[PDB]
Each structure stands twice: as C-alpha cells, then as structure tokens.
Point group: T
Chain length 64, copies 12
C-alpha cells in the first residue's frame, strides 16, 4: 500500500529545486519515499524579498 502526502516545496532558484525542497522534507520524516507527482506550481512575489518558486507534489511512500 502506498500513501501520499500533499506538500508544497519552495525555492528562490527554480521549480525543480522547489520540488526537491518538498521531497527533502518528506524524506526527513518518512521512510520508503518512492515517487512524487507534480500537482501545481506557482510563484510568490509580493510578500517575499526575492521571488519564491513553489512546486506542490503528492509524495508517495510505501507503507510498512
């Protein structure tokens, strides 16, 4: 059985790095992270010093 958690990563560099940011967080607290599916991307502009890229992923991990 796989379970997914819906995480939004951020990065001041790129959409790819914002995906990695979410995946890094999942791997910090979850065992057996197997894949991620991009479900949304955006950019925070007027509440941040630099533009922040965001990539939202469903991060899948195998249960047990």
């Amino acid at each position: 059985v796989f379970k997914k958690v819906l995480l939004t990563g951020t990065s001041e560099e790129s959409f790819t790095a914002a995906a990695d940011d979410a995946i890094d967080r999942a791997e910090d607290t979850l065992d057996n992270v197997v894949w991620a599916e991009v479900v949304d991307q955006g950019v925070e502009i007027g509440a941040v010093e630099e533009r922040t890229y965001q990539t939202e992923v469903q991060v899948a991990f195998e249960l047990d």
Copy 2:
C-alpha cells in the same frame, strides 16, 4: 514547506460555516494554519434531521 490536509466541515447553516468547521478542526490540532482551498461542496439530506451543508477544503499549514 507547506502541507495540506483534506477535511470536510459540516454545518446546518451554510457552506461558509461548513468551511469554518473544517478550519476550526485544523486549528485545534495544527500549528501555523495559513490558508484553505475549497475543493468540493455538498448537502447531506436523507440521513440527517436537518439538511447539512458540507464544504471540503485542503487546509494548508506551514511545517516547522
């Protein structure tokens, strides 16, 4: 990093109040709730005394 939990709030009054019901629950058990996105709305009719409005939200909260 933001994480979302997928909650359905209920209310006998309105769709807005059913959204608040889910958000209240998230704020009970989660720190740093930042926003909610409506993903579905419905009404329970024939298993309840009064019509119950339901609003399903992805409730986003900042990790750490």
Copy 3:
C-alpha cells in the same frame, strides 16, 4: 440504485440558499432525495432587478 438530476437553484440571498432552492424543488417531485453535490455556482447580474445567486447541484435520490 441512485439517480441524479441536474438542477440550478436561484436565490437573491446566497449560494447556500440557491442550493436549497434546487433541493426544495427536487423534494417537491421526488421521493427519497438523499444528497446533493455542488457542480457550479454563478450570479445573474444584467437581466435581473437584484443580483441572483445560482447554485447548480446534482441531486441524488434512491430509486424504488
């Protein structure tokens, strides 16, 4: 077996009340109305005296 009918309710007050308007109509002519799913919302503005909120629902009822 459940069947759905696709109804748009209207109200000069709110989206919730426009949903109720469609559900009321379904309950007038159908037995065993069990639930409704919101599929669209809109507002009629320039052909009405007051803004009219509209909520379109799939209203489910149990057959037999």
Copy 4:
C-alpha cells in the same frame, strides 16, 4: 461579444459576499456587467486578523 475578467473578491463574512465584492469592483469600472461564474473559493487564515473568505469569479460584460 462578451469579455470576462478574472477577479478574486474578499469578505470577512461569507463566500457569497466575497463574490459580491468582486462583482462590485467590476461594476465600478465596467459597463454592461451581465453575469459571473465562480471558478474558485478559498480562505485566507494566517496573515489576516480575521479569516477572509475569497471567491474568484469570471465576470462577464458585453462589449460595446
């Protein structure tokens, strides 16, 4: 010919009132506003004093 503008209204009270907020703004600056279609709803929580309901609408107006 109709044209649509994509507006997000806000309200501290309800999703219906947040729709009205966007429609009010369209009627301030546009002639012949005829209808609005709800395309999204959400709630701002952790950057506001009170929860703020948001309703995003495509507001249609007749050209000429």
Copy 5:
C-alpha cells in the same frame, strides 16, 4: 468533520480487490472509516512477477 487519506491499494487479482487492500489498511489504523472515492487506477507490469492492479482511493473517516 471528515478527513481523507490518499492510499493506493494493490492486488494481483482485480481493481476491486486493490481498493479493498487500501481500505483494509485504513481500517487497521483508523477509527470510523466511512467511505472511499476512487481517484485513479493502474497496473504495474515490468517490475513485478505478476501484473499488479492498483486502485488509488481517498479514504474518508469521521474525526472524533
């Protein structure tokens, strides 16, 4: 309030049995599982001995 968890069940027999596999897992660790919604189905072919059917479900459970 209902909460959903996004689980992918697997089975070497059928899509229905892969749904049951996810639901079984939810019932192992969650109280008050009330319903599941199918959101995706697939088949793993070239990394398994036998084809494995997969059914991804949002499994809803009542909070409290």
Copy 6:
C-alpha cells in the same frame, strides 16, 4: 438523438457488478439502452453491513 441518465449502481461484489446494477435498472425502464460511461466509483463502508462497491454511469439510450 441519444439521452443519458446518471445512475449509481451498487454491489457487494465488485465495481463491474455495481455498473451492471445501474445498467439493469436502466434496461428495466428504458428502451434502446446502447452504452454506459463510467464517471465515478466509490465504496460505502461505515453505514452498511458489508462494504458496498458503487459505480456511477451515464447510461445512454436512443430516443424514439
């Protein structure tokens, strides 16, 4: 001209049999049922003795 009715079939056995349940019902009351399109699947769990599979279909029938 074809018309569709939106029916949810149920079964304690499988998604396929729940589709048949809706189609059987359509064929009971309609002439010239030609095809069905699956639009949703789910499982009722916590209000039934046994899990009940549900398959929602648009059942198409030729008018005249």
Copy 7:
C-alpha cells in the same frame, strides 16, 4: 429553477447542426428551453454510411 437534460444530437453535415438536432428534440418535448452547453463532440465513422457528427449538449429549461 433550471433543469438540464444530457442529449447527443447527430448530423451528417456539421457539429453546429448536430447541436441543433439535440435542441430540436428538447423543444419537441419540453417547455421553456433556455440554453444549451456543449459538453462533447465526436464523429461516428465505421458503422454509418456517411460520417455522422455528434454534439452532446446539456439543454437547460426553466421549471414551471
């Protein structure tokens, strides 16, 4: 209150004429047909003498 019926019109000439075919049928049996929304288009090729264009519409009519 508006209700919609989901009809597929056919024509050997065009998608527009296939829409009219469904609308004609609705106007034959329904009072107060107000609008139609195109939801799908297709072409039947290998079971017909000539290609047949099909346009599927939700045909809306005002109740009462």
Copy 8:
C-alpha cells in the same frame, strides 16, 4: 510574451462563425493577434429571436 483575453463570440449561423466574431473583435482593438483556443461553446435559445451559437475563445496576442 503573449497575453490572452477571454472573449465569447456569437453567431446565428455556426460555432465557427461565433469564434470568428470574437476574433474579429480582438483584431479590432489589439495588435499582433496570433491564435485562439476554444474553451467553451453554447447556444442561447429562450431570450433571442433565433438560436444564437456562442464560442468562447482565449485569444492570444504578442505583447510589444
């Protein structure tokens, strides 16, 4: 950079001609119109003398 405007054209003749109606309007007031994407089609029936076909397009134009 391209920008899109969301226009609904109308015609008493066809969906193609309703698309042209929106595109004509865009070309009246915009320079460098490059393409259009159909996003919706419908028919106005019960508020017009003759059925009116409508085609909604995102009309893209190159900025500068």
Copy 9:
C-alpha cells in the same frame, strides 16, 4: 482492442471540416477507423494568410 491516434486537422472553412481533415488522414493510412472524439479546437491567425480552424481528435481504429 481499439487504439487511438491524436491528430490535429486543419481547414480554412470550419471546425467540422478540420475534424474531417484529420479523419481523412487517419483513413489514408489506417484500416478500420471507427470513431473520433474531439479533444480541442483552435484557430491559427498570425502566421497564416487566412485564418485556419483546427480540430484535434482522438481517432479510434480497431486493431486486427
């Protein structure tokens, strides 16, 4: 078993004729073309002498 190929037809006349253009091409090189499903429509404007209507279809053909 049916297979689909994803083709975009073009025409200087209409969306229907652009669908036929793709279907003609499929029938040139494929046996047993049975149906087509419209998946997108658009208009090329600023790189062509005359506006070109485009209709994208999944063209289904029976294998064997």
Copy 10:
C-alpha cells in the same frame, strides 16, 4: 524515455479483464511494457450479444 499508446481493451467479464486485454495486445507487439494508467471505462450494450466491458489504458513502454 517512455512512450504511451492509448488502447481500449474489451471483455465480457470485467473491467479488470478489459484492462488485461489491452495490456496483452501491447505486450504482443511492444517490448518493455512497464505500466498502464486507466483513463476511461465503459460498457457496450446495444450492438453486442453480451454486455462488453471496456477499459481504456495509456500503456507505457520504455524506449530502446
């Protein structure tokens, strides 16, 4: 690099077996079939002796 082909399998027994029918066909003519994603399901009723279940899959295979 993976490539997908869009196949509809059929079966007089079940949706799972109709998926297998498409996958079998892909494995007949393609090397390195790795997975399939269900994209649609339906039932042919009024042109067949027995109801025929259909499952449409994107069948993925590794190139080279």
Copy 11:
C-alpha cells in the same frame, strides 16, 4: 480585490525563466503584483532557432 492576467513567458533556458519572463512583463506595467499560478508549459521547436520554453501563468495583482 485581486485581478489576474493570463500571460505566456518565453525563455531559451528553462521553464522557471519563462515564468519569470511573464512576471517581469506584468511588473513592468502593473502595480502590486502578488503571485503567479502556472497553468501550462510548452516548448516551441520548429519555427525558432533554438528551442523556446514557455510557461503560461495567471499573474495576480491587488487592485487599488
């Protein structure tokens, strides 16, 4: 009230840089640009010297 404009940025380097290209343009002519949502990505290949990445964004800005 927020308003969105639908812009496609281009870049010969990356999808992230194509998003920035659209956002830069919005910030050139609009005050209070607050966020952008990615709605599509593509690559222009056979009408350009080098591949051009494109990222289409809804760019949101606060009115007033």
Copy 12:
C-alpha cells in the same frame, strides 16, 4: 495535419532537461517536430541512485 506522441523524458538535473530528453528522442525518429505540450511532471525517488525528474510531453509533428 499534426500528430502527437506521448513521451516521458527523464533527467537527473531538472524538469526542463527531462522535457528536452523526450523532445530529443522525438527528433531522432521523426521529421518536422514543431512543438511540445507539458502534460505531467514527476520525480522517481526509491528505485534510482539519484532522484530522476520526469516530464511528460505531447510532442507534435507535422505529417507529410
């Protein structure tokens, strides 16, 4: 007439480079590749040495 093939490119570096990987493959075996549309992105994590970014594209090429 344009035809599309549905390819998933991979890269250990970025989503943009994974798109290029699919496009490179299409240009290896196809003449007149004109554009690509991103339809999905993901990351393979727990079956690879390094995270692998994947970008799925519909790659369009002109027939003849």
